[PDB]
């Protein structure tokens, strides 16, 4: 019955800044609440529980406030190590509710995606399948929507997606989408497309190539 | 250092089963409530189930009650989550994690946490099946090959049951792709291989697919 | 403690009494026990302690024996009874099974016909090309086949597929499917099957020319 | 009408882990003895394990002695087993099935089977990657596709590490087929295309594989 509601979902900060993340909760729940540090691929760590108890080992720039259904986790300094997904939990008895995690990120400006796509290659579409790659470069924020068009037809299903974490350089991300088809309903279609909304872009941006270049 | 390890995680089909387990190290589980919580695409954590001292009481996210079974093994420190009918939204990174005991607190979170494992639901529940010739070249035989198909059954008839003598449908092995594959084979007189036409004609129930395949000489 | 069973396929009528023999390495007293098991099924406990029957099997199965020697007799063999039976010796903290007795229907010997598939030129343009071998209509089931592929002995690239025995004629029909990669099948140009069976007083070779 | 239910079957690579269990129907299992047993291909079968009741001793045929784990839980009325760094002779069907009670008997038969699942352990634990090109047509984009390859990580580095500026190689991701997949990219300037070659080296340790692939304008 308690949901808890995170604010807000992508905070981005410079190194040396004190950060605030507040979490909302639907119901009174006192004090029963904990907060916990995650990186990508590692398990979640706890730093604070009962909404303001640091537990032992964790830096004192990290300290927590509030009650009833307000709460604030409060990071003072920001070092380069606190970049990271940060969850908010309300623990009961028998069972807990989590916030959507909100993920702290190195500030810089906005960067529209560089796209490109690529061709299957011979040797592969002999083989037997068509693998068709779509790369969207050095953008940020990270958010972007990749949508397939094969003969003007929009795809659904059959299409899988990665991202690179920010650059170490300059704090960008990549987005890889890579198209698998047959190579038989690869070579029955000409036109294959891939389309990209990014929110420093004013229209979606296409890029494509005829089958047999 | 106080230590949980999952295993169990691995790739499975919609509509599949899959069980992990969490062993531990360096504390014993009797005193703690155990619990499941899974990492969502997106980013966010998910409570999914727990299971309370002396199994008391087990509890359960609404997204999976009546599907997931949590259990604990007090004696050698286990706890096990099984999945049954699973969806694509079960797609997660899955730990296992305690619940925090005191003699000076009722209430506490979760201090510790394993790594996690991988757990990813295939969206095709069914496959339809490949229908390939076995080419004829006194007694003569021909066939049809039926390949990467899921799950089992398939049926083999021969021109739409009028043929039935001296056929032979074999038991469907399993590949090492997951996908099952079968042949059917007759045995013809070799003078009827001009005359007579063979059609051999795969019904695949699960996925509704139906496949008529006329096997000719080859030249 | 090992046990073994005598015969490993033991061929006969309906109507028969037959007996299956359990052998223990040691003395393992009276703890043991006999299952019947149809392919595709769960085994099922017939006779306990040697010599007790379990509630709901037929009359017709009685077990004896002690020490090291044992029995299973089968009075008045049934279709139904056309199966595999196992022996097991069982304590309170250790259990071993025998290897199994088939019980078939007997008939004459019958040398399998032999046929060869080259795969599909859809299937080869697909990119898989699957060789199909056929052992029709032969007794009893043993049989080896092997693959060759330019001359060159083929391993782990091939599974097989057995029907049961024939309602009208009782014999046996096999597949051997040897699965290869578009790439891996154009290096090469003779592909056969060799098949060994009791029924063929040399092993006999079916093979093609890929591309004719 | 006692029945017995097992779950948890499946295709597994060598070295990996699998997890079964068990209900029931019509029964309770507390007061009896519950088993593990497999059907080997070839029709022999093979006592796998025993859990007692009240789990006062848990028994292993030697060949899982150390990677087998039998566990019960009699308030729901499940067995399970969990099976680790599994060979290719655990390719079997796996039974459970019930002894009578250990507290009233020192030697009793299985008496209750469960129908089976089914357990396929491929011998192959490593398979290397497939390199493809990702040809380019002021700044272009070429990059390599690594595909097929079991387990994680493989390693890319470009010219043999001469050339980093720009390189983004991506999470690899599992495929439906249960192999991983994953690309490498980089940017240069579009006038080096013709002077400069660009080789993507893979390195994938778990099967001992290296692959250099040249990546030019087709």
């Given at each position: 019955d308690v949901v808890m509601t995170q604010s807000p979902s992508t905070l981005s900060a410079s190194v040396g800044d004190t950060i605030t993340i507040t979490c909302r909760a639907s119901?009174?729940?006192?004090?029963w609440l904990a907060w916990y540090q995650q990186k990508p691929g590692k398990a979640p760590k706890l730093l604070?529980?009962?909404?303001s108890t640091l537990k032992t080992?964790?830096?004192?720039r990290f300290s927590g406030s509030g009650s009833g259904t307000e709460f604030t986790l409060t990071i003072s300094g920001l070092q380069f190590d606190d970049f990271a997904t940060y969850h908010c939990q309300h623990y009961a008895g028998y069972s807990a509710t989590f916030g959507q995690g909100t993920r702290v990120e190195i500030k810089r400006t906005v960067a529209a995606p560089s796209v490109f796509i690529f061709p299957p290659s011979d040797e592969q579409l002999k083989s037997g399948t068509a693998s068709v790659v779509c790369l969207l470069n050095?953008?940020?924020?990270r958010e972007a929507k990749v949508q397939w068009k094969v003969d003007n037809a929009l795809q659904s299903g059959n299409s899988q997606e990665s991202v690179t974490e920010?650059?170490?350089?300059?704090?960008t991300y990549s987005l890889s989408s890579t198209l698998t088809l047959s190579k038989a309903d690869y070579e029955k279609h000409k036109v294959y497309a891939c389309e990209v909304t990014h929110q420093g872009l004013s229209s979606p941006v296409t890029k494509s190539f005829n089958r047999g270049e | 250092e106080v230590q949980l390890v999952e295993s169990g995680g691995g790739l499975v089909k919609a509509g599949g089963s899959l069980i992990l387990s969490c062993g531990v190290s360096?504390?014993?589980?009797?005193?703690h409530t155990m619990n499941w919580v899974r990492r969502v695409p997106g980013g966010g954590l998910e409570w999914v189930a727990s299971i309370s001292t002396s199994s008391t009481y087990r509890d359960y996210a609404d997204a999976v009650k009546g599907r997931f079974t949590v259990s604990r093994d007090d004696l050698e420190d286990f706890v096990y989550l099984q999945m049954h009918k699973?969806?694509?939204?079960?797609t997660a990174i899955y730990y296992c994690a305690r619940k925090g005991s005191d003699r000076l607190s009722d209430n506490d979170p979760f201090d510790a946490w394993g790594p996690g494992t991988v757990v990813t639901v295939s969206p095709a529940s069914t496959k339809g099946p490949s229908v390939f010739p076995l080419a004829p070249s006194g007694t003569a035989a021909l066939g049809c090959l039926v390949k990467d198909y899921f799950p089992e059954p398939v049926t083999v008839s021969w021109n739409s049951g009028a043929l039935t003598s001296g056929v032979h449908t074999f038991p469907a092995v399993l590949q090492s792709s997951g996908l099952y594959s079968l042949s059917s084979v007759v045995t013809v007189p070799s003078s009827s291989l001009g005359t007579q036409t063979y059609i051999c004609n795969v019904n695949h129930k699960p996925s509704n697919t139906k496949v008529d395949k006329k096997v000719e000489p080859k030249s």
């Open positions: 119901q009174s729940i006192e004090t604070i529980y009962k909404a080992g964790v830096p004192s050095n953008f940020y924020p920010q650059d170490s350089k300059d704090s | 360096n504390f014993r589980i009797s005193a699973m969806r694509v939204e079960d």
